[PDB]
Coordinates of C-alpha atoms and ligand atoms in Angstrom, one line a residue:
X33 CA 52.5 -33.7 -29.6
X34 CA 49.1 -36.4 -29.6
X35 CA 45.9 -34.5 -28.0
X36 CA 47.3 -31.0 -27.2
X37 CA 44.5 -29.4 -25.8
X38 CA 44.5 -32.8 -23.3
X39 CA 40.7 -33.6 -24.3
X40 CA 38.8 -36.8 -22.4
X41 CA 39.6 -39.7 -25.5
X42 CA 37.6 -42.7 -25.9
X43 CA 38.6 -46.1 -27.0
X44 CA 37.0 -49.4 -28.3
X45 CA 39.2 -52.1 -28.4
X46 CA 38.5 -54.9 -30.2
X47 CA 38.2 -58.8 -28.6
X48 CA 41.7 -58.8 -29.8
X49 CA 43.0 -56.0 -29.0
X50 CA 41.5 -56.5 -25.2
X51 CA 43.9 -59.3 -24.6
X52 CA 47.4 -57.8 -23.9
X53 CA 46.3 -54.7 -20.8
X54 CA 49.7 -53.3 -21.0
X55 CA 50.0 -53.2 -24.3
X56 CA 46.5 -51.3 -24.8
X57 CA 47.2 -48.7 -22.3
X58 CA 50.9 -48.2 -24.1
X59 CA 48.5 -47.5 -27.3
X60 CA 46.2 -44.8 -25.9
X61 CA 49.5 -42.8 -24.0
X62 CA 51.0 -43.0 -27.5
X63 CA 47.8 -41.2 -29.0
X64 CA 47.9 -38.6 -25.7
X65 CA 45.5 -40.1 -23.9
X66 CA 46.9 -39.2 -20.5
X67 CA 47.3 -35.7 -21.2
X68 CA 43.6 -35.3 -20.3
X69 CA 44.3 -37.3 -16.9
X70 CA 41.5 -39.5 -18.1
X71 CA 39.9 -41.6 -20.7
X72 CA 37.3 -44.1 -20.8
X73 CA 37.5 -47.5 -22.4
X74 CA 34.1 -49.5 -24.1
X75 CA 34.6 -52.9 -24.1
X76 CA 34.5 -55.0 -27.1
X77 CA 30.9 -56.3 -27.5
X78 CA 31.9 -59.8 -27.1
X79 CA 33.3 -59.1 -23.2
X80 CA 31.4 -59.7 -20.2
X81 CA 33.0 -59.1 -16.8
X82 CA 30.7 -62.1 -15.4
X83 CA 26.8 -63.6 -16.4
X84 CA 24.4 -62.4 -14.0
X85 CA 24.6 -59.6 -11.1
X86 CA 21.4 -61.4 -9.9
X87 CA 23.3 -63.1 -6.7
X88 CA 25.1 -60.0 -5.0
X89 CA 22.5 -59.0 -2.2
X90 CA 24.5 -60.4 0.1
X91 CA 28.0 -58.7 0.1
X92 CA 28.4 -56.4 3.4
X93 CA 29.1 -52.8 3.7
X94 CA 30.3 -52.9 7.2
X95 CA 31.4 -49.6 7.4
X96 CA 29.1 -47.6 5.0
X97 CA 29.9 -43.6 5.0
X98 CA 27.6 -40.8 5.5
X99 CA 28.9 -37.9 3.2
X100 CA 28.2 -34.9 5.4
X101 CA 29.0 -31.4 3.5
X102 CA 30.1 -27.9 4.7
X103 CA 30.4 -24.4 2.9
X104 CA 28.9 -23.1 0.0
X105 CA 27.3 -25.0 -2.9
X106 CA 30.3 -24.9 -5.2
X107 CA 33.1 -25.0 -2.3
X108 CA 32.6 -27.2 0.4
X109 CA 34.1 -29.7 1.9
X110 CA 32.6 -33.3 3.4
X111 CA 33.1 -35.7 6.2
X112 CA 32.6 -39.1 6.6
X113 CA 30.2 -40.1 9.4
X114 CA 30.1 -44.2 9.9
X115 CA 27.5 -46.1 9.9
X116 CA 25.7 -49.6 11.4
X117 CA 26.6 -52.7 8.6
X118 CA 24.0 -53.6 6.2
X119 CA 24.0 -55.6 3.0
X120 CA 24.1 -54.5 -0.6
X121 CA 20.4 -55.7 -0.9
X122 CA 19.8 -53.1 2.6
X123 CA 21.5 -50.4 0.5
X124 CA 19.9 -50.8 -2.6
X125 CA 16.8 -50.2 -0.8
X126 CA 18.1 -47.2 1.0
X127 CA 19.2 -45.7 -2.0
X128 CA 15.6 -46.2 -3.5
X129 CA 13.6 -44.6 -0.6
X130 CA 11.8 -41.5 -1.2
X131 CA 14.2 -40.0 1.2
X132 CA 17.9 -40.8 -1.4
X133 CA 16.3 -41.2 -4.8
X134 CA 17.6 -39.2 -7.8
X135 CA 14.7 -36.9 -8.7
X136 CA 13.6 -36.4 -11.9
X137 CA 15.2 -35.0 -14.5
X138 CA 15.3 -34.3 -18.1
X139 CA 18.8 -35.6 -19.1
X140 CA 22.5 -35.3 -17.0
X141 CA 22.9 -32.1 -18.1
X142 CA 20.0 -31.2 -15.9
X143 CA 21.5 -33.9 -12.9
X144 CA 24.1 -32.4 -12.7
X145 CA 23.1 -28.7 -12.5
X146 CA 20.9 -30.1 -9.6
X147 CA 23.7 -32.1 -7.7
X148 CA 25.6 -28.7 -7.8
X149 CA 23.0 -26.6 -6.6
X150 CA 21.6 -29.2 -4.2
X151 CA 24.2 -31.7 -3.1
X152 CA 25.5 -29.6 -0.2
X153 CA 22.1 -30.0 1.9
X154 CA 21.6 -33.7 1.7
X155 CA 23.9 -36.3 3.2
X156 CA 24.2 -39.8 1.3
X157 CA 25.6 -42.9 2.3
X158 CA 28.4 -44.3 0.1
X159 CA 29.5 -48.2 0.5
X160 CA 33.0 -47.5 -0.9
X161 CA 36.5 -49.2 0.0
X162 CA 35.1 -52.6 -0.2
X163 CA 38.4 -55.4 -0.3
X164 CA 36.7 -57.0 -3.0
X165 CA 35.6 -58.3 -6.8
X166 CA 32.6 -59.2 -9.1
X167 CA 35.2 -60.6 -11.9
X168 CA 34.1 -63.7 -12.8
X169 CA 37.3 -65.7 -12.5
X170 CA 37.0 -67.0 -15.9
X171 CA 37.1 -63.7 -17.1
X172 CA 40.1 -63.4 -18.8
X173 CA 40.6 -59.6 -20.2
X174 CA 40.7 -56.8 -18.4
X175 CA 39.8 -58.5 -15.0
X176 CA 40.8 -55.9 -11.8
X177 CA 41.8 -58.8 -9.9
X178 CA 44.2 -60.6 -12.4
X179 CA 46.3 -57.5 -13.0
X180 CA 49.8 -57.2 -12.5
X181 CA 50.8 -56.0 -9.5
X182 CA 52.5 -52.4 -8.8
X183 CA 55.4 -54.7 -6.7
X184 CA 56.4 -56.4 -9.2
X185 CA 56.2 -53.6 -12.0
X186 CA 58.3 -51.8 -9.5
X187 CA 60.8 -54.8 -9.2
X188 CA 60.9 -55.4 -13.0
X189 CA 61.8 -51.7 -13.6
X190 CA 64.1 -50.8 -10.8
X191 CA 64.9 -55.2 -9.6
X192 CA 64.0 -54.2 -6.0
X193 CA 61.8 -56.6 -4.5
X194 CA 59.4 -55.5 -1.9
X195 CA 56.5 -56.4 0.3
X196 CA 53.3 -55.6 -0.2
X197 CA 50.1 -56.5 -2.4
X198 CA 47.8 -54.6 -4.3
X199 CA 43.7 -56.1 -4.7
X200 CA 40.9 -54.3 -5.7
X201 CA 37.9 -52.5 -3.7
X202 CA 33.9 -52.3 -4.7
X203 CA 32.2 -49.0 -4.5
X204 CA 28.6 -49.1 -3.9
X205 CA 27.3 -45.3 -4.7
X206 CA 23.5 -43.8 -4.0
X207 CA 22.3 -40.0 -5.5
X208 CA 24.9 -37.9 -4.7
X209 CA 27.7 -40.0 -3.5
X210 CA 30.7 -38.0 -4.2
X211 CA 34.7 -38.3 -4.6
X212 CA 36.6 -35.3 -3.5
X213 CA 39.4 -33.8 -5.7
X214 CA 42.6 -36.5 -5.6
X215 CA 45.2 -37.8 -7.2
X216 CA 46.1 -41.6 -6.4
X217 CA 48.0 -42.6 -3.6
X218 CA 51.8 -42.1 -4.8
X219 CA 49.8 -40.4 -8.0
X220 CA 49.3 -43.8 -9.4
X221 CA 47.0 -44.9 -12.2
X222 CA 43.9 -46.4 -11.2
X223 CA 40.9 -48.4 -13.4
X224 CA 37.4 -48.2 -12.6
X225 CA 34.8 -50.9 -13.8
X226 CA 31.0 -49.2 -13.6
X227 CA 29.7 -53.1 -13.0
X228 CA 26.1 -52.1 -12.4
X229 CA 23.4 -49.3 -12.0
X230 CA 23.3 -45.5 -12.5
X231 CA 26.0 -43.9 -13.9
X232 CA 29.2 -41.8 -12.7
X233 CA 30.2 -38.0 -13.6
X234 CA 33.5 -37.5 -13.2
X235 CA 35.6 -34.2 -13.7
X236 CA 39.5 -34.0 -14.0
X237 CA 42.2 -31.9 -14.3
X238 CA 45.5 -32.4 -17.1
X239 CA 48.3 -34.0 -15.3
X240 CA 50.5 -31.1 -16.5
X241 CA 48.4 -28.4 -14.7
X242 CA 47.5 -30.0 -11.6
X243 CA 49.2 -27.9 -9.6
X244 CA 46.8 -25.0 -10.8
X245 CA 44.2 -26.9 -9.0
X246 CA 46.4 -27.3 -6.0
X247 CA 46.8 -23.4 -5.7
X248 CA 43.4 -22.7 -5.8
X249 CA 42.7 -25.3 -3.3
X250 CA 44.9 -23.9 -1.5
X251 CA 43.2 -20.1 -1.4
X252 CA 39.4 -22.0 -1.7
X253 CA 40.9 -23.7 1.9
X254 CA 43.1 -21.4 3.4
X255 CA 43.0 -23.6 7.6
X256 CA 43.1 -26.9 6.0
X257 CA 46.1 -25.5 3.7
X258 CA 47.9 -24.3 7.2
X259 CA 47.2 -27.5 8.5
X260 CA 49.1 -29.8 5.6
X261 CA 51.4 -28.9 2.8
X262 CA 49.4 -31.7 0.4
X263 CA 45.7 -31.4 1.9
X264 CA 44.2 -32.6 -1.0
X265 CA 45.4 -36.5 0.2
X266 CA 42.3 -35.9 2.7
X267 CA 40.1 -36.2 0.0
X268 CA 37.8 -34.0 1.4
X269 CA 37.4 -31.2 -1.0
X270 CA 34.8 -30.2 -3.4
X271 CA 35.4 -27.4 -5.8
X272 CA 32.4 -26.9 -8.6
X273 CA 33.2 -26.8 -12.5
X274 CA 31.8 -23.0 -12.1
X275 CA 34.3 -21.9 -9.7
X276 CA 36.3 -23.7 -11.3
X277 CA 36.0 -21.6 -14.7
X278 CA 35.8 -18.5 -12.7
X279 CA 39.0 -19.4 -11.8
X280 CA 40.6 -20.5 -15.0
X281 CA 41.4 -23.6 -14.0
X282 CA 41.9 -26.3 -17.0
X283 CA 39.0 -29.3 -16.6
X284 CA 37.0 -31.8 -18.4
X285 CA 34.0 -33.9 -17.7
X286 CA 32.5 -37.2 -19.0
X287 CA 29.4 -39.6 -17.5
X288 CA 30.6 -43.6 -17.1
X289 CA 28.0 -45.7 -18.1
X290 CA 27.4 -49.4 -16.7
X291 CA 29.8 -51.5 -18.7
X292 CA 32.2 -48.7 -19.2
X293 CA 36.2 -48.2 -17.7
X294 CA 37.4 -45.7 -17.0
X295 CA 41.7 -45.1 -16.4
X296 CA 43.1 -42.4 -14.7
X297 CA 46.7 -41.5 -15.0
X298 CA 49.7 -40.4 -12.8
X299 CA 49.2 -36.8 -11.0
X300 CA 45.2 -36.7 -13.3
X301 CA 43.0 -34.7 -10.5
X302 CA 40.0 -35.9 -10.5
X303 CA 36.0 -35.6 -8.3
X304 CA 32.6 -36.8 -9.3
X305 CA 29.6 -38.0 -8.2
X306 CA 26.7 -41.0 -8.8
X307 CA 23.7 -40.8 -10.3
X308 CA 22.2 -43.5 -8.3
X309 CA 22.5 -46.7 -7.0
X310 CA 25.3 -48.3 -8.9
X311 CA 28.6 -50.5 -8.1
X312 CA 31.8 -49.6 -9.0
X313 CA 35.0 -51.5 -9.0
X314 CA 38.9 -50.1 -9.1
X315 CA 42.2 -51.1 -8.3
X316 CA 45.7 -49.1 -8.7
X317 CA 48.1 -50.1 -11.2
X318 CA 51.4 -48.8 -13.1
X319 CA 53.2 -48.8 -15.9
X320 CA 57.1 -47.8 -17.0
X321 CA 56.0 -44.2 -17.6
X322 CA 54.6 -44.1 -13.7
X323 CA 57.8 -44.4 -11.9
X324 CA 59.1 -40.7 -11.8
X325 CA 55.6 -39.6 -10.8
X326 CA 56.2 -41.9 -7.7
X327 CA 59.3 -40.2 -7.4
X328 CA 57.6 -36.9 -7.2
X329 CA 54.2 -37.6 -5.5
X330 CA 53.2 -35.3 -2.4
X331 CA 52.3 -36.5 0.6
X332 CA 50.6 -36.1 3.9
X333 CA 52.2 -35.9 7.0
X334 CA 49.9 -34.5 9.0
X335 CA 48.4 -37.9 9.5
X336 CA 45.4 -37.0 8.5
X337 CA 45.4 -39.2 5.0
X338 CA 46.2 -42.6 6.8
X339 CA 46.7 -45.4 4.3
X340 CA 47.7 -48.7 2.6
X341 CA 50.3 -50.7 4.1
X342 CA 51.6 -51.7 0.7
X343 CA 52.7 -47.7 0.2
X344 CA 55.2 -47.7 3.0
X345 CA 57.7 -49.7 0.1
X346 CA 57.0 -47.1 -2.2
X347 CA 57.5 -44.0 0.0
X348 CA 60.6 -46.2 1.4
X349 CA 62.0 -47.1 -2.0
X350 CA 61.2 -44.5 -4.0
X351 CA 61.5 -41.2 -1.9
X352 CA 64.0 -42.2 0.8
X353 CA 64.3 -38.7 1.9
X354 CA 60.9 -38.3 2.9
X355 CA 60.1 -41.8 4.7
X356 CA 61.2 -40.8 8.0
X357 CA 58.6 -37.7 8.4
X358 CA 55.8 -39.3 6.6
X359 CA 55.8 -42.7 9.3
X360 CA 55.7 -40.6 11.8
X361 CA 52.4 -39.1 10.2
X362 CA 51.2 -42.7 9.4
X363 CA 52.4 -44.2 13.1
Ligands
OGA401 O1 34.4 -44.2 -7.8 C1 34.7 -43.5 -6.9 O2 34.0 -43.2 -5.8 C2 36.1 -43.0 -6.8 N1 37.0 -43.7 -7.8 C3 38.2 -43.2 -8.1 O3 38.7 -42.1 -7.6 C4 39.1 -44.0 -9.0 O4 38.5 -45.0 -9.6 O5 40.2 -43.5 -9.1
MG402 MG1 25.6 -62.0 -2.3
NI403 NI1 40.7 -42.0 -7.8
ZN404 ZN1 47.6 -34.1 5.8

């Protein structure tokens, strides 16, 4: 068995082996890559994923997020407070202030013990779930918005045609912007393209014990547990890597640089947070190997985790039992 103790593996591809996406990620599942839930992907030094960033000031965060925390410093949970529309050149200058900055520090090591003993009494503003790209259209490897789409891998494997599409979203991240413990929706892959900026920690949990995490989350939350058989769809909960060693809970950690992907694979846990100002782009995808953990995925049918139209065929299609309860959650 390929990578047994499910370590974080890193890949660079050459120019010709970054042609064929499918292919590449069929090469790092056959080396065990996706036992770790996670692995990050360097470019070959040739790739661009467009000339300049010099001309993006003007994109609109209508809805940027104020990340408002409760509980203790390694437990807590957040909300997400809305906020008046400004541009990405507006929230670049936010994220700069005296009042948002990442202070100093020696190295991430030393970031990172601070955004665990601090993050909890500041509030940052995240510009995330953008419906867009910075993919140059002539970029022809690797581009988030020329990927297959999860419709038509699920018609190819299973020749059920459904609705739906699947495009990606821009992140636009500050000091401290975080992403709570989740799998993807129907615990599908996703890629993430750091495009710009300060870079992103990220921690994540082996696919085969990520239910470990999900019963300590459930003791670590004991009302929000009550509340919804698969609370962690909220994506609302923090757990630190210290509790989570205390706890013997399996994890690693890694730090995305600009220029750097990283993939995330079926039923991988994973939480992080930014550095600083940066911009982040990620789509959803899937492969073959995918389909039985859509099969299997959780949900929420509380109505609390509210999403996509395009996952109503998958829930529909692929857990027919289910679809019934979990509309009534999402209507
Ligand atoms: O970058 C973020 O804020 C969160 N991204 C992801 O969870 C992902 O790419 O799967
Ligand atoms: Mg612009
Ligand atoms: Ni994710
Ligand atoms: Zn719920």
């Amino acid at each position: 068995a390929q990578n047994p103790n499910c370590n974080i593996m890193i890949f660079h591809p050459t120019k010709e082996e970054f042609n064929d996406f499918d292919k590449y990620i069929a090469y790092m599942e056959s080396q065990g890559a996706h036992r770790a839930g996670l692995a990050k992907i360097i470019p070959p030094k040739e790739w661009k994923a467009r000339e300049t960033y010099d001309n993006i000031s003007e994109i609109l965060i209508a809805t940027p997020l104020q990340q408002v925390a409760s509980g203790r410093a390694g437990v807590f949970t957040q909300y997400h407070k809305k906020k008046k529309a400004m541009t990405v050149g507006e929230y670049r200058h936010l994220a700069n202030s005296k009042k948002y900055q990442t202070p100093p520090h020696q190295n991430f090591e030393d970031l990172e013990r601070k955004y665990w003993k601090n993050r909890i009494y500041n509030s940052p503003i995240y510009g995330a779930d953008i419906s867009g790209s910075l993919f140059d259209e002539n970029t022809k490897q690797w581009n988030l918005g020329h990927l297959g789409t999860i419709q038509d891998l699920l018609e190819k494997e299973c020749g059920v045609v459904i609705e739906g599409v699947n495009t990606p979203y821009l992140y636009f991240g500050m000091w401290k912007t975080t992403f709570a413990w989740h799998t993807e929706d129907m615990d599908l892959y996703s890629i993430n393209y750091l495009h710009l900026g300060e870079p992103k920690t990220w921690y994540v949990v082996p696919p085969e014990h990520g239910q470990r995490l999900e019963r300590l989350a459930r003791e670590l939350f004991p009302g929000s547990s009550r509340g919804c058989g698969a609370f962690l769809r909220h994506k609302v909960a923090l757990i630190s890597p210290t509790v989570l060693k205390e706890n013997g809970i399996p994890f690693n950690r890694i730090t995305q640089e600009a220029g750097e992907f990283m993939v995330t694979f079926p039923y991988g846990y994973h939480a992080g947070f930014n550095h600083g100002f940066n911009c982040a782009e990620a789509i959803n995808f899937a492969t073959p190997r995918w389909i039985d953990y859509g099969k299997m995925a959780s949900q929420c049918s509380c109505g609390e985790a509210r999403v996509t139209f395009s996952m109503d065929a998958f829930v529909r299609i692929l857990q027919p039992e289910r679809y019934d309860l979990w509309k009534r959650g999402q209507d």
